[PDB]
Write a protein that binds this ligand. Structure first.
Ligand code: HEM
Ligand code: HEM
Ligand SMILES: O[C@@H](Cn1c2ccccc2c2ccncc21)C1CCCCC1
Ligand SMILES: O[C@@H](Cn1c2ccccc2c2ccncc21)C1CCCCC1
Lengths: 368, 371
């Protein structure tokens, strides 16, 4: 569909994002395009404080509003965390905080860098006529030299794209259930598992493009927010826009709509139950684009694919459903091996118990 | 016309014509629920719950019977857990009532605890079927204690839920007028909605006639509170025979009412958006609405914003019509805010003050929505 902003080729990713803002915002674009140098030289916070308050009125369309959210978002994290060694700022200056909050209010997103900014909207094609492959793609913004932010973002983006192939089968699933078309539903579930199995092979590229100590000690710092953070115990002051400081969670892949979408489709009660994992994945929906929030909730309004398969006494239909659940377990299991390489060894123990709980919930959803 | 969603033309989100009696197979359940005041005060409610046999849910054939069974099992559960309402708490719900309550709640996609849709939307009847829906012609189906003001509290909420129903049927007219670009139809629709919300404010005044501040704070409030962030059941309540761990579920609230969230969504009042505790609370309370009412709120959020439509037109008449609805929402919460001060703030001085900071936040969000 169209009002959910789900593309045929890139799915939840923003199709063909905008790389440049109008000349009116050149003072923004220069800072965001040179974050590794302005941070390393100890001049980023000065350049930010010298900016004049630019109006968001010249951001006329959707794509340019998403780019400015990415620009202002990357500068905010660069201003709050600085060099990423402890010298923080608990007040975001109004010349960049007021337009950030105004733009975030308009796009119904929190004023902090989220997954839909630094992954779904932070990419470009090198050559337009060539396909969406890692060698033909690039990110628009980074934080530090050697933060491996290109590999981390683009590999997440590429797994998102690989999962988009399964997203377009979803309407066939619900149509087959309503029309009681058993053979069509089986073929569709097998196709959804096939696409999720291709996405697992895409995931393997993470070792080639992401370095362990680079992600743990650099990129992770600039992606963390100010909710439950001892460094900003009461949040961030959004100067000129809010009286009190506000708390917002740093970016996450719980913000990725892809995995939440198949949890709902297959009846994997991730957001139910009551655990911290349930509440966290539920809260991270507030950090998705509004169109993608509505898509997840619209899947939850449809009849359960799980209860349909359980009620038929159909072996071939339970295996096709199990192939979809199995593909989700395979992804989170391989992803769990990635987190031990990139987080546990460089170190955190709560992340494992969170991921193991999400994976545990998925594996217990199998029928055999 | 709205589909279902389960929204009535006359009573809106309330259950139309609730069932008063379960089949004979469940006579052991109905006897306890119908005699809570005597069984609680005499201290023999918990015994008669424990010597119940584990009845099956298969004999609740239709929707209205399952909603009544959710109402009776919900009232017995609060009575069992809170007892006489003075501190002696049970942390274990016996299996012969825990597993049919959880089985039935699993089927209706609701959590195993009394919610607004139980004790308000499904907890009423007409005294005379032919006479209109007024306070004098209505009555609740269940109460906790004698003098808990549960009749006046449940029916006054129910009456303004009906008063809002007149504005819910105009919602399809609002979105069709935007899609088909009918400016005059939309303006008339927004004015019709604002009028109904102003009709509902007058119904709200009956709260002083039929509710007592001391009876609500010290009696009815105890039986409606739940086991989520509660120092009396810090880990939750164990539903014996169904879950091995204790589970936390929030007490009944009017944040579970769909009418006020429904108009926040329609007017683009970003209540659930933002990071505040009030935004987190109102989103969490949707998990406590009936599934058809959850899906209706979701369906509204998927439609284009009525607010951005009115802002983009440069139309003074359209803005005044949109402002009349926001003004009507501010007037309701403001009057409701003065009710809480008489019924919660003053009895507390012989949650707490967080109830006031919560309601002032949602009112401020509604008030700042003006143009
Ligand atoms: C070096 C690579 C990666 C690291 C270090 C990493 C780390 C983490 C951590 C620590 C979490 C849980 C805490 C939190 O989300 O805040 C998480 C969650 C998640 N990650 Fe990753 N991740 C990596 C790659 C990926 C990729 C490429 C994807 C592609 C879709 C992905 C998908 C997810 C999802 C869906 C979640 C939410 C939890 C779940 O649904 O199981 N991760 N990641
Ligand atoms: C004694 C009379 C009343 C009292 C003491 C009372 C108290 C409260 C309190 C404390 C809250 C927010 C706290 C919470 O639920 O956890 C609340 C919310 C609410 N009440 Fe009431 N209430 C009363 C009557 C009514 C009536 C008649 C209605 C009409 C439906 C109503 C509608 C609501 C709604 C919709 C909310 C959600 C909060 C919001 O407006 O955003 N209340 N009430
Ligand atoms: O890496 C993030 C989690 N996370 C993201 C955060 C922001 C933007 C994207 C992601 C992300 C993307 C894919 N997998 C995990 C992800 C971080 C979460 C807090 C603990 C360290 C790891
Ligand atoms: O007043 C109730 C909230 N509440 C309900 C709870 C259960 C069922 C209905 C209601 C309700 C209905 C209207 N207003 C407030 C309401 C309670 C809120 C939490 C603090 C103690 C007082």
């Amino acid at each position: 569909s169209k009002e959910y902003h789900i593309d045929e080729e890139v799915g939840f990713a923003l199709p063909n994002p905008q790389e440049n803002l109008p000349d009116f915002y050149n003072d923004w674009m220069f800072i965001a395009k040179h974050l590794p140098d302005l941070i390393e030289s100890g001049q980023l916070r000065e350049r930010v404080e010298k900016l004049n308050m630019l109006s968001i009125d010249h951001l006329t369309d959707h794509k340019s509003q998403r780019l400015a959210r990415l620009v202002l978002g990357c500068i905010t994290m660069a201003y709050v965390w600085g060099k990423g060694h402890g010298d923080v700022r608990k007040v975001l200056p109004r010349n960049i905080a007021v337009p950030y909050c105004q733009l975030s209010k308009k796009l119904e997103l929190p004023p902090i860098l989220v997954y839909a900014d630094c992954v779904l909207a932070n990419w470009k094609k090198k050559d337009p006529n060539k396909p969406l492959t890692y060698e033909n793609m690039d990110v628009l913004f980074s934080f530090r030299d050697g933060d491996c932010s290109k590999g981390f973002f683009l590999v997440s983006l590429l797994v998102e794209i690989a999962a988009a192939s399964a997203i377009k089968v979803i309407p066939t699933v619900f149509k087959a259930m309503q029309m009681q078309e058993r053979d069509t539903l089986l073929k569709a579930l097998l196709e959804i598992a096939s696409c999720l199995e291709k996405a697992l092979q895409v995931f393997h590229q993470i070792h080639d493009h992401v370095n362990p100590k680079a992600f743990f000690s650099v990129l992770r710092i600039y992606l963390s927010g100010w909710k439950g953070n001892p460094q900003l115990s009461d949040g961030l002051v959004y100067e000129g826009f809010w009286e009190d400081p506000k708390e917002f969670a740093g970016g996450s892949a719980g913000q990725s709509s892809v995995f939440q979408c198949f949890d709902v489709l297959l009846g994997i009660q991730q957001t139910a139950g009551g655990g911290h994992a349930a509440q966290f994945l539920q809260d991270m929906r507030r950090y998705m684009p509004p169109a993608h929030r509505n898509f997840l909730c619209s899947l939850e309004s449809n009849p359960s694919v799980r209860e349909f398969v359980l009620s038929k006494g159909d072996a071939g239909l339970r295996e096709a459903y199990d192939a979809c659940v199995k593909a989700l377990v395979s992804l989170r299991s391989y992803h769990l091996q990635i987190v031990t390489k990139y987080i546990l060894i460089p170190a955190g123990t709560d992340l494992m118990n969170f991921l193991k709980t999400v994976r545990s919930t998925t594996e217990k959803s199998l029928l055999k």
